[PDB]
Nucleic acid binder design. Structure first.
Lengths: 271, 88, 117, 55, 51, 100
RNA sequence: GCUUGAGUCUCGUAGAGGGGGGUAGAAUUCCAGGUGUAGCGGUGAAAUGCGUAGAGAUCUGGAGGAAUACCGGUGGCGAAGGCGGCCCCCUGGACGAAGACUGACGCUCAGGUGCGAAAGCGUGGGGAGCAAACAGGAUUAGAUACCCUGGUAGUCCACGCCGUAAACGAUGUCGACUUGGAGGUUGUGCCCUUGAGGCGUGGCUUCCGGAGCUAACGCGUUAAGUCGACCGCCUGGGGAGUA
RNA sequence: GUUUAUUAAAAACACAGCACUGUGCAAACACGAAAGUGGACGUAUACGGUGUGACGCCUGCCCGGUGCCGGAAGGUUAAU
């Protein structure tokens, strides 16, 4: 659960840790590891393109099954592991033919649970099926946008998607943003919601925790100069014009969505 | 509620004479079994204050019965607590 | 120029005002009238005589359609429904049945506290 | 004494709008009135009796 | 609630239009039945009435 | 084992599958070593108010003595299978008059 | 030592007693659509407001939240706060015919501990109605209000606080005795198995009333009557349940 | 903690927190004349932009002006 630290020092005064004793203490599964090198704030042109990304802890990428397959083969769940690359925890699962894979761990999943992925799979948290064998109203996660592509929606910790309706070839989904959108019914979805729902309850306590995450300091345009930001300047604190991005586009309000080939799929815009 | 077969088993176990359902050891053992079952109940169901009042009534009744048995016969009290596993 | 001759009167009566609406059997409304369009304001439109004038004007609006038989569905606590059936029967439709479809809920939503005075 | 599966007795103990008639009108006892209300609600849930006559 | 006109009829009216419970309960579900004061006052009045 | 009473309604469209699910449910109870006290099929029956905008529905009653685990599995089966519009499983008022 | 106080077991009975989950039906609101036109809404009157970009009214489909019309009761349960759709799971208490068992194991309890309406506070959700604050329009001599039109916190859920109420029956708990009538609710014995008919025995309750008590109002077998055990509280009003 | 490495180390900047707003993934946004790339082998408990700056108590009134969001009935209105 959440652990409020004793204020033995400033920086430990205001930190809440979320700790899971169920998580595996030790090395991850080495056949499903890849090299992950830091490249944020670095284009192939070498320029910073996303600001406030820099050095954090070294991390290794875990190959997680998102396009879940091996239909009809049950898999027993071994110990849940920690994943630095995402807010969610992951589960190392072992199929009956001797194949280990990494799964986005749902909320109720424990070590020893059985999961399955086919069209004959019983509907149960941790099982994935296309959304024409899944009843309307169930909360799902790790749901594809195209049939066979892999889960793109509800991958963060604690997130879920509600199956609201069925067209007959499309399935309407209420997303975590409140948006309703039409997704094809042959797209697969894992049942239940994603675990680690206490991830939003952590408070980092100090600037060093953000630096271990990998977030470089954010400078305000009011603190900058007129050459640097559209905000900036003045012989006091007040600038006094409409708030904008560093490149001039207005940032309070001003919806910026220019897609026209997916407007047929978004049904109700998020509120 | 404790089942009829369970109460019959505890009465037969803790009664050295047949049909001794009113003796202090039998009453304390019945209360202890119901207390363990209700601890298993309340772990899943916190905030059941109305049933916890009956639990505390059973705890107080068991404690008063054990106090009476300790005043009456200390050997019976020690034998009962060493076969029940309480009051450390 | 309608040949089916079956119509439904919907009388939404309330303590301020009444509304009469003649529709077909499928729910598509054909005509409507009200005490305010009849020419009464406040207490004069809360009177049941304004409901009689409203139902007469609504029947005048449906005289082009020429409905022979007319169901009646009243709704609300208004005093004007009891004159509205009488005005429609004086207009000349044959009333096959009279129905009361006022919304009597369950506890449901919380009622207001307003107008305590 | 009172079972919800038959319908003729239960329509005799409701009114035309589907409401349960009061015990002061029916003359039945309080225990049987409570059992009657429970059976009426169960039959309403299984749609053997309507909640209201409008729909 | 529901009436249907008998096929011999001289006028269309309702024979229970003043004793109907619909307008009696609608004015109460509009606002605030207390369920502890008015039932007590009504039962006290009934107990004083019947003797 | 605990006594129970299960009444469920099936689609008129899927009214030909009713003996198959009767065999399935009785097989589940007898495999979980319970017994069926009663079983009645009232067939297609007019319903008082329309649910799911649907016509008259197929009515099945059974009185069943079975463990609460297989009764819970039966109720979750009734939840997940969409051929049953409505199900009610009730413990109380057991030992009713036969064929009422 | 005893059972007669207290408790336990067998078999049943009623109940919105509590905790968790699922589901159902009216209704309100919102969205999309069909018909249709010039008003709707509100009030003692109006006006702000909605509607000429189509409101209100009627019908269809969908979404979401909250509370469960009738039953419903001078009913029921819980120590109190309190608890109302239906179904399941776990569970507390009460009562009854009959029999058995232990044998004073009992009563009260300053400190202590737990529970504790509504409003409020923290974190995370939810938000349909209602609605403090706020805004507009009325009323008025004025109106920071009563009234109307909106409307945020809140009301709802999870986990933590807070620990107060006209938390009242303004009546602390336990035990015993003391004339009566009329009902309600819930068990049981007998009679003529022929009926929701008659005669008893228990519990919980509502009203009237005799002696008695009280300053009086009134209480009156569930006492404010006659006693016993223990605890809490008061010593003129204001200051003040304040520093 | 950082800062004008060479006259200013500060109350300045940053900061954990807080809020607003954009973003349904071929995401927003950024670099790029385009391919492509970062964001991210992430997926609304995520990412960006803005302002404020632990914590405690709080954050009142004003939408007339300028922005932004929503609507298209009417007026004006380009190439054609």
């Amino acid at each position: 659960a959440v652990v409020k630290c004793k204020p033995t020092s400033p920086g430990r005064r205001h930190v809440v840790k979320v700790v899971n004793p169920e998580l595996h203490k030790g090395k991850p599964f080495a056949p499903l590891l890849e090299k992950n090198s830091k490249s944020g704030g670095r284009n192939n042109n070498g320029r910073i393109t996303t600001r406030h990304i820099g050095g954090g802890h070294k991390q290794a990428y875990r190959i997680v099954d998102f396009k879940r397959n091996k239909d009809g083969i049950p898999a027993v769940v071994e110990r849940l592991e920690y994943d630095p690359n995402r807010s969610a925890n992951i589960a190392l699962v072992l199929y009956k033919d001797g194949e280990r894979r990494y799964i986005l761990a749902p909320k109720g999943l424990k070590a020893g649970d059985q999961i399955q992925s086919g069209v004959d799979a019983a509907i149960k948290p941790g099982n994935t099926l296309p959304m024409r064998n899944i009843p309307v109203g169930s909360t799902v996660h790790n749901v594809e946008m195209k049939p066979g592509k892999g889960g793109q929606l509800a991958r963060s910790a604690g997130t879920y998607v509600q199956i609201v309706a069925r067209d007959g070839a499309y399935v309407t989904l209420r997303l975590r943003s409140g948006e309703m959108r039409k997704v094809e019914a042959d797209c697969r979805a894992t049942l239940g919601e994603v675990g680690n729902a206490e991830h939003m309850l952590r408070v980092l306590g100090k600037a060093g925790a953000a630096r271990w995450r990998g977030v470089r300091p954010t400078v305000r345009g009011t603190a900058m100069n007129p050459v640097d930001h559209p905000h900036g300047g003045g012989e006091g604190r007040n600038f006094g014009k409409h708030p904008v991005t560093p490149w001039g586009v207005q940032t309070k309000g001003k919806k910026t969505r220019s897609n026209k080939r997916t407007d047929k799929f978004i049904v109700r815009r998020r509120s | 509620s404790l089942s009829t077969e369970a109460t019959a088993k505890i009465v037969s176990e803790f009664g050295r004479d047949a049909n001794d359902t009113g003796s202090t050891e039998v009453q304390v053992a019945l209360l202890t079994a119901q207390i363990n079952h209700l601890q298993g109940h309340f772990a899943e169901h916190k905030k059941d204050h109305h049933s916890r009042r009956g639990l505390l009534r059973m705890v107080s009744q068991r404690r008063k019965l054990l106090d009476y048995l300790k005043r009456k016969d200390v050997a019976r009290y020690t034998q009962l607590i060493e076969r029940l596993g309480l009051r450390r | 120029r309608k040949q089916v001759s079956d119509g439904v009167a919907h009388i939404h009566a309330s303590f301020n005002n009444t509304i009469v609406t003649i529709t077909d059997r499928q729910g598509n409304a054909l005509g409507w009238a009200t005490a305010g369009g009849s020419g009464f304001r406040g207490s004069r439109k809360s009177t049941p005589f304004a409901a009689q004038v409203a139902a007469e004007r609504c029947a005048d609006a449906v005289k082009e359609y020429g409905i022979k038989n007319l169901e009646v569905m009243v709704k609300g606590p208004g005093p004007g429904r009891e004159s509205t059936i009488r005005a429609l029967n004086a207009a000349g439709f044959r009333i096959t049945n009279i129905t009361d479809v006022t919304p009597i809920p369950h506890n449901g939503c919380r009622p207001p506290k307003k107008r305590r005075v | 004494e009172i079972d919800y599966k038959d319908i003729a007795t239960l329509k005799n103990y409701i009114t035309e709008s589907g409401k349960i008639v009061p015990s002061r009108i029916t003359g039945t006892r309080a225990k049987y009135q409570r059992q009657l209300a429970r059976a009426i609600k169960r039959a309403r849930y299984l749609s053997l009796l309507p909640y209201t006559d409008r729909h | 609630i529901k009436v249907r006109e008998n096929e011999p009829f001289d006028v269309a009216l309702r024979r229970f239009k003043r004793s109907c419970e619909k307008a009696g309960v609608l004015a109460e579900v509009r606002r605030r039945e207390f369920y502890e004061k008015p039932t007590t006052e009504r039962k006290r009045a009934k107990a004083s009435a019947v003797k | 084992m605990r006594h129970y009473e299960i009444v469920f309604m099936v689609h008129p469209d899927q009214s030909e599958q009713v003996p198959g699910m009767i065999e399935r449910y009785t097989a589940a109870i007898t495999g979980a070593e319970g017994k069926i006290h009663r079983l009645e099929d009232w067939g297609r029956r007019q319903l008082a108010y329309p649910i799911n905008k649907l016509h008259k529905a197929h009515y099945v009653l059974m009185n069943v003595e079975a463990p609460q685990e297989v009764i819970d599995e039966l109720e979750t089966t009734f939840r997940f299978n969409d051929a049953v519009i409505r199900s009610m499983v009730m413990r109380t008022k057991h030992a009713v008059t036969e064929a009422s």
